[PDB]
Design a protein around this ligand. Structure first.
Ligand SMILES: *[C@@H]1O[C@H](CO)[C@@H](O[C@@H]2O[C@H](CO)[C@@H](O)[C@H](O)[C@H]2NC(C)=O)[C@H](O)[C@H]1NC(C)=O
Ligand SMILES: *[C@@H]1O[C@H](CO)[C@@H](O[C@@H]2O[C@H](CO)[C@@H](O)[C@H](O)[C@H]2NC(C)=O)[C@H](O)[C@H]1NC(C)=O
Ligand SMILES: *[C@@H]1O[C@H](CO)[C@@H](O)[C@H](O)[C@H]1NC(C)=O
Ligand SMILES: *[C@@H]1O[C@H](CO)[C@@H](O)[C@H](O)[C@H]1NC(C)=O
Ligand SMILES: *[C@@H]1O[C@H](CO)[C@@H](O)[C@H](O)[C@H]1NC(C)=O
Ligand SMILES: *[C@@H]1O[C@H](CO)[C@@H](O)[C@H](O)[C@H]1NC(C)=O
Ligand SMILES: *[C@@H]1O[C@H](CO)[C@@H](O)[C@H](O)[C@H]1NC(C)=O
Ligand SMILES: *[C@@H]1O[C@H](CO)[C@@H](O)[C@H](O)[C@H]1NC(C)=O
Ligand SMILES: *[C@@H]1O[C@H](CO)[C@@H](O)[C@H](O)[C@H]1NC(C)=O
Ligand SMILES: *[C@@H]1O[C@H](CO)[C@@H](O)[C@H](O)[C@H]1NC(C)=O
Lengths: 199, 243, 50, 50
């Protein structure tokens, strides 16, 4: 309600599966640009934003979420356009006079400005999913653990099909699932009433 | 100020994911075997300030007589023009403060006087204490090992040590210059140099690293990386181009 | 003429081959939404309209 | 129980995202059946043995 996202593009995951997954950790990079420069926030692309202000890694797994707002933010903002060397991914530079001259140019934001030159708020959510106890997780409620029946299970975003049996496998304090044979998850740990279940 | 050899003391965990009972290859920054160090000793008169190169990661070491080393300063100009890391160990808390620093001549305790526009400030909280620092995708990865070092004329042991991955930082800063903070009251610290290397790493049932290969130095290491094994039967084998 | 098509995306077939094909049956689902929510009408997507 | 249908207004003097867009989704299927809706391409003479 009351927020219409102009661009919601997820690389590595899909926006239809963000409910089912629990992330180990999430970072949110937040900034504000022009309306036509939203298309530059994608892995493997260059421009004035993806070269001199904010670059994305090629092994990216996240979601770019950008929405137009030409009325909330009115004024003047700064951007870099004259750097000698392109940035490494996920890096920051604050040297305004690294070339001696002012390398930070201004650009204004009024409601009565043409189409491409309007303020868009961009949030890049970079999250990683691995064998760790998750912190940020989806809104799906839990169910009763049923054993000795061929069931579909969704344990912390590890969707599978099998029979859960009480087992005594040796896990660490941080392990959430067990790889065995040719990389198959066959020993897992339920997040509520933590114990070891063999699939 | 002399030179010693890296007796297999630079092996760390490359990926944060979990693996067990496998032998896998990598093309990561690594400190290869039989390398060189630049370790300096503390006398009555000794080093004051030196900017050694932070070349895509650094292997730091000490022997730490009492509490001699206090931390590290990572930067690219070491002024109040570009921000700096300034890892310290005051009291019993380890803190990181990415701010603009007008620090003094020699970093010592009993390190900085002027600090403005902080972009990051976090509090974390005969001993070896060897570290590996690297920077990748705006993240400062630190891999530490608190080994109870053996006993002067200093050197390095030959016991293998899988350096446990410590905390990493979302700093968002590029680093090429580096400085060590010491204690001046009116020990040894050692500097390595990371480079891109293909390596082979084994894992046990506990997720611990058993042994390393570093197939860029020896023909037997290259053979071990070629045949995807650590035990090699008697015979002749063609090898790849890992050197 | 007099209709400017802002988005014409065909899944399964191509807009360059709509002349050459005769369809067995066609249905047209017709409605009206906001301008930023047109990007949600695609297979495998979530939003408010999807 | 509560009203689950929310309103949204449409005026000419409204910003970029909140403007009306007419959507038609044409879902057609192609199979072994006599077609009804077909393309505008004219037929030619049936020639054999070539
Ligand atoms: C429209 O959006 C507003 C906020 O974006 C929602 O308002 C909240 O509604 C809940 C329950 O209805 C209240 O407890 C909050 O106090 C409201 N927040 C306010 C008034 O700031 C509202 O529910 C949304 N309506 C629809 C139909 O989605
Ligand atoms: C422009 O569009 C209009 C309407 O879409 C077309 O007007 C029709 O033209 C045909 C023949 O030219 C007439 O039989 C119709 O009565 C017209 N419809 C009207 C007036 O509503 C017109 O042909 C188009 N012109 C071009 C060049 O594409
Ligand atoms: C709440 O969390 C604890 C800790 O794991 C768990 O044992 C307990 O069953 C949970 N309760 C509910 C209602 O989810
Ligand atoms: C490293 O060892 C070589 C001898 O092989 C020596 O010449 C050189 O000075 C040493 N490096 C340093 C920094 O002392
Ligand atoms: C590495 O250095 C040690 C000590 O200098 C030396 O004895 C050894 O032969 C070198 N090579 C290997 C492969 O260990
Ligand atoms: C830090 O800023 C102060 C400003 O008063 C300046 O005097 C000082 O020289 C600066 N430090 C540098 C450039 O190393
Ligand atoms: C160590 O430094 C931090 C950073 O300002 C400070 O909060 C803390 O009180 C200091 N502790 C001691 C013992 O000086
Ligand atoms: C340093 O802090 C002051 C105080 O807010 C601010 O005005 C100035 O812009 C900051 N410096 C930079 C380079 O942003
Ligand atoms: C780090 O940044 C500084 C200032 O932006 C620059 O001078 C230096 O070349 C950079 N080092 C790299 C990219 O290795
Ligand atoms: C794993 O740790 C246990 C102690 O919990 C130890 O008994 C066992 O030998 C270890 N396994 C390996 C391969 O070192």
């Amino acid at each position: 309600n009351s927020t219409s996202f102009s661009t919601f593009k997820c690389y590595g995951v899909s926006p239809s599966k963000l409910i089912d997954l629990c992330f180990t950790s999430v970072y949110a990079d937040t900034f504000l640009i022009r309306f036509s420069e939203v298309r530059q926030i994608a892995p493997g692309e260059t421009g004035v934003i993806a070269d001199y202000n904010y670059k994305l890694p090629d092994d990216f797994t996240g979601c770019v979420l950008a929405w137009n707002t030409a009325q909330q933010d009115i004024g003047s903002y700064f951007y870099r356009s004259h750097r000698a060397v392109k940035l490494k991914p996920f890096e920051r530079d604050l040297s305004s006079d690294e070339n001696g001259v002012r390398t930070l140019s201004t650009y204004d934001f009024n409601p009565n400005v043409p189409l491409d030159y309007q303020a868009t708020r961009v949030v890049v959510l970079s999250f990683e999913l691995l064998n760790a106890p998750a912190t940020v997780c989806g809104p799906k409620l839990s169910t009763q653990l049923v054993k000795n029946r061929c069931v579909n299970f969704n344990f912390n975003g590890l969707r599978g099909t099998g029979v859960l049996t009480d087992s005594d496998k040796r896990f660490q304090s941080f392990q959430q699932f067990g790889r065995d044979s040719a990389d198959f998850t066959d020993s897992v740990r339920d997040p509520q009433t933590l114990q070891i279940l063999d699939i | 100020k002399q030179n010693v050899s890296s007796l297999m003391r630079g092996v760390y965990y490359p990926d944060d994911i979990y693996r067990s009972n496998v032998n896998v290859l990598f093309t990561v920054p690594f400190l290869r075997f039989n390398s060189t160090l630049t370790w300096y000793n503390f006398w009555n008169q000794a080093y004051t300030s030196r900017v050694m190169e932070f070349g895509d990661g650094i292997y730091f070491s000490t022997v730490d007589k009492s509490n001699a080393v206090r931390g590290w300063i990572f930067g690219t100009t070491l002024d109040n023009t570009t921000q700096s890391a300034l890892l310290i160990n005051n009291g019993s808390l380890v803190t990181i403060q990415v701010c603009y620093f007008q620090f003094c001549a020699n970093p010592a305790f009993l390190v900085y006087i002027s600090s403005h526009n902080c972009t990051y400030s976090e509090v974390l909280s005969k001993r070896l204490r060897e570290f590996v620092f690297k920077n990748n995708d705006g993240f400062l990865h630190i891999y530490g090992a608190y080994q109870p070092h053996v006993i002067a004329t200093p050197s390095l042991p030959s016991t293998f040590k899988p350096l446990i991955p410590l905390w990493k930082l979302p700093l968002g800063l590029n680093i090429t210059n580096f400085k060590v903070v010491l204690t001046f009251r009116s020990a040894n610290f050692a500097v390595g140099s990371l480079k891109l290397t293909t390596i082979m790493l084994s894992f046990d049932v506990n997720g611990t690293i058993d042994k390393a290969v570093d197939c860029s130095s020896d023909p037997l290491s290259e053979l071990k990386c070629t045949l995807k094994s650590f035990n090699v039967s008697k015979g002749i084998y063609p090898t790849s181009n890992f050197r």
